């Protein structure tokens, strides 16, 4: 899981799931491309390019798969304060980044 | 096993082994690119394209792995006669098919795959270019190799180098060096430690010096020289000798091509 | 074995083996064709003609297999004297016959069988021809081979090459090269991997370079060198050293011919 | 003692690091010329950041700071994941390029020194013997100039075994045949120089050096051999570094004879 | 052993053996006198002078055995640093001293000990002298050795001969002979069976041919190359590589000397 994938992560397993759920919910609320376009996958990490057969009214074109990303930063002072006061970790910046990856996909689509 | 993979093949298990050996030997003898260019292993099925990082800071290009194949037919009349008389099957057509594919691979290695946008050693962008003088005069050929070898040194390529020349130019280092009273091929072989090779794919007075090493260039083998039964057609048994190979030139500056100015 | 194959043979099993060993040794010492041409066989007695696929730079031609033989005679007086004195039987005449079958094969391999219309190395259509200059001057012989080998290389025939020269040209290769302090034959032997041979069948200044490989040319043998009793005739014991061989040139472009103008 | 525990954050397993080590080491061995005729003094260890050299001129102690030679290459995470998914061995081509560059750096430091730390080289050390060679294109000059150079070492109380390293052009010129003996000059030289006649791209033009092999004459002081260290993961990619710490000590400068073109 | 011989030695038994092996190897790589002169010993520490019977072409002379030594110093800071870092002790200075004792023996063997009045190969009375010509011209070096070896042969000294030349003359032997396509040194090496050596002790154009054999000349060693602790002085550890050797030339007529006019 995430905890063993990033042993140095300040977020625990429960804290990291909230990071995933916040990102997933923010993506679904903004992904308009996936609302009507079917998904061919998940292919997996072993695929870096796909072959597209264009039937004009066939032509085979090798479409390399782009990677769209947004970074965002979780400041340590906020994380330490949340741990000290036993309050849930704020992931508002994480949702903002997901809204920008979902906007990048829509621009690319 | 090829026996169970082609249940309808007329050849037995041992006959396929002889057919495979004939194809392998004919290809290996006729292949000049693989002598000095290393193989990026058997990629196998599931890798239809490969990525080449071109260094001139690197840039990435997606290279589609093309299929090179030649078709040969084993006539049933000849097959039945060999089985009846217990004489070995003549796979001379198989050897010619492997020879033709090997010639095709060498053309793809040197002159590139134009229809697949894959460059070759003789036309890769960014390669060094050297102009050879009159190699008919003794000593000019050695000096040209020295000048071209120094050109690769200027671009941080210390060797070991491999030199491939056209047959017309190759049959010019087989002359006594008047300065040293030795064959000019021997002096070049001392400088070119990876060997000097000929190739019919090069026409006229052309040649290329390649700094050997898997970090400069290699061949991505999706599947090595393999034979496949195309299925019975008109009572005969056609086979396909096919291979899936692409050439990756990671550092084009490691290739210096000798070009006749005329 | 031979004793039961020819019950009337004056030679015993041991005596007949010496006949075979003498014939075999005399054949190997003279067969220059088999030194670089691969054997397609032994097919057996059930094959009398072979199919040759000529790839010109396919054409199927039915090559009937010729039979080459020499007879020789073992006189009974010599055989009786040897038995009486307990000395080994002299097979010098047998070796002489084997030297003539091995010369007949070389003639058929290099010049072809006119009666059966089978081509040879020096005669086949579709071969490459190189006109040699004056090999007497040192250094010309190496250059002529270099240019002739270049013609084979331009046809995607990258060796290994086998060069057969007439004894006049073969001896001309033994002079020291011009300015490389090395015998001219040694430099050619580096160029020709399969070896440089000589054959008396080639007359004058002539030679041939053949790109070896059974996919280029091969030798079809239904039966190798064999000795057969022809039956006693006039108290003598005539035999026959025979073989059924034929040369199949599948790739005529793999043969480069050196001739003089 | 495996590098997996040394770099827990590395993406390579025990076997992948092992394949990485051979790729770096083999590419280094193919290019390291100085190590062929110079003994290795070490590995001293991480506690030796500078070595002491006692020069016996024909005694002065000089402190040499051990230089660190390195080159960086990056393995892309997409490539590592793609190879891992397809069960294909990782492509360490960039590692060989980095290892080859470091090997050239060590050879360049051995011969031409290191101006940054004022460490002398074979062709730069003070007190060495200098021999002005002649036209090696003409016959006999190549062997004679070596004989006088060896005589210079003999007069300086150094009686072998010698090691001769020549520029790549001069090494080929030694393959000529002798004017009278009708034997190649290289075998005559090889009988005089029994530690081996080598060639190196570092020497340019008509240049060479004759070195009296022996620990008491000169040696390589290394604290860390060719080692691949995993740098921190940056930008989701994995950058590595092939580094080594080697300094050359010439205890007897008079045991080195340099062939210099006038 | 060494540890109990010098209880105050900073070097352990393993460290002291490396001192001995370094000294021994450096001596063998430089001792040209012992390559052809037989050893009469080790006599032992109980012998300080030897009797030489000179057979001129007997005379008894008491040759006192000289002692040749070089000191060198092992600094304590280097020894302490090596112990702290667990690295082997550097003995480069020790090898340098051994190269100077092996040069002192060669000087004493070839030129003699003037202080003890002991003759050498190049200096003894009763030797044969040959005046070499111009060795620069090819073929003169071989001829000069031939005539000089002839002088030894006329004195019933029929080999095996050992020839030692100065580096100037030794390198002059490496040119190809005049018209025999063979290196001049190779022809001399055929003439001189015991081998042709060179010594830096011989200056200019000079050399010597010695007819080997312990009945002609020998080397008397009471003690071979030895390393002795001289006791700590100024925190340093001075040693001494020493040997007690002397050359006895019993037959001065067995030495032929090559000099230039």
From Swiss-Prot, chain A:
<comment type="subunit">
    <text>Initially thought to form a 180 subunit shell. Forms hollow shells composed of 240 subunits, making a shell about 42-43 nm in diameter. The monomer is capable of assuming 4 different conformations which allows packaging into the icosahedron. The shell has 12 pentameric and 30 hexameric capsomers which form the vertices and faces of the icosahedral nanocompartment.</text>
</comment>
<comment type="similarity">
    <text>Belongs to the encapsulin family. Family 1 subfamily.</text>
</comment>
<protein>
    <recommendedName>
        <fullName>Type 1 encapsulin shell protein</fullName>
    </recommendedName>
</protein>
<comment type="function">
    <text>Shell component of a type 1 encapsulin nanocompartment. Assembles into proteinaceous icosahedral shells 42-43 nm in diameter with an iron- and phosphorus-rich core (1Fe:1.1P) which can store over 23,000-35,000 iron atoms (with a calculated maximum of 83,000 Fe). There are 2 types of negatively charged open pores in the cryo-electron structure; a 3-fold pore where 3 hexamers meet with a minimal size of 7.2 Angstroms and a 5-fold pore where pentamers meet with a minimal size of 2.3 Angstroms. The 2-fold pore seen in other encapsulin nanocompartments is closed.</text>
</comment>
<feature type="site" description="3-fold pore central residue">
    <location>
        <position position="8"/>
    </location>
</feature>
UniProtKB/Swiss-Prot annotation, chain B:
<dbReference type="InterPro" id="IPR051429">
    <property type="entry name" value="Encapsulin_nc"/>
</dbReference>
<dbReference type="InterPro" id="IPR007544">
    <property type="entry name" value="ENCAP"/>
</dbReference>
<keyword id="KW-0408">Iron</keyword>
<feature type="site" description="3-fold pore central residue">
    <location>
        <position position="232"/>
    </location>
</feature>
<feature type="site" description="3-fold pore central residue">
    <location>
        <position position="8"/>
    </location>
</feature>
<comment type="subunit">
    <text>Initially thought to form a 180 subunit shell. Forms hollow shells composed of 240 subunits, making a shell about 42-43 nm in diameter. The monomer is capable of assuming 4 different conformations which allows packaging into the icosahedron. The shell has 12 pentameric and 30 hexameric capsomers which form the vertices and faces of the icosahedral nanocompartment.</text>
</comment>
<dbReference type="GO" id="GO:0006879">
    <property type="term" value="P:intracellular iron ion homeostasis"/>
</dbReference>
<keyword id="KW-0406">Ion transport</keyword>
<keyword id="KW-0410">Iron transport</keyword>
<feature type="site" description="3-fold pore central residue">
    <location>
        <position position="233"/>
    </location>
</feature>
<protein>
    <recommendedName>
        <fullName>Type 1 encapsulin shell protein</fullName>
    </recommendedName>
</protein>
<comment type="similarity">
    <text>Belongs to the encapsulin family. Family 1 subfamily.</text>
</comment>
<dbReference type="Pfam" id="PF04454">
    <property type="entry name" value="Linocin_M18"/>
</dbReference>
<dbReference type="GO" id="GO:0140737">
    <property type="term" value="C:encapsulin nanocompartment"/>
</dbReference>
<keyword id="KW-1284">Encapsulin nanocompartment</keyword>
<keyword id="KW-0813">Transport</keyword>
<comment type="function">
    <text>Shell component of a type 1 encapsulin nanocompartment. Assembles into proteinaceous icosahedral shells 42-43 nm in diameter with an iron- and phosphorus-rich core (1Fe:1.1P) which can store over 23,000-35,000 iron atoms (with a calculated maximum of 83,000 Fe). There are 2 types of negatively charged open pores in the cryo-electron structure; a 3-fold pore where 3 hexamers meet with a minimal size of 7.2 Angstroms and a 5-fold pore where pentamers meet with a minimal size of 2.3 Angstroms. The 2-fold pore seen in other encapsulin nanocompartments is closed.</text>
</comment>
<feature type="site" description="5-fold pore central residue">
    <location>
        <position position="181"/>
    </location>
</feature>
<dbReference type="GO" id="GO:0006826">
    <property type="term" value="P:iron ion transport"/>
</dbReference>
<keyword id="KW-0409">Iron storage</keyword>
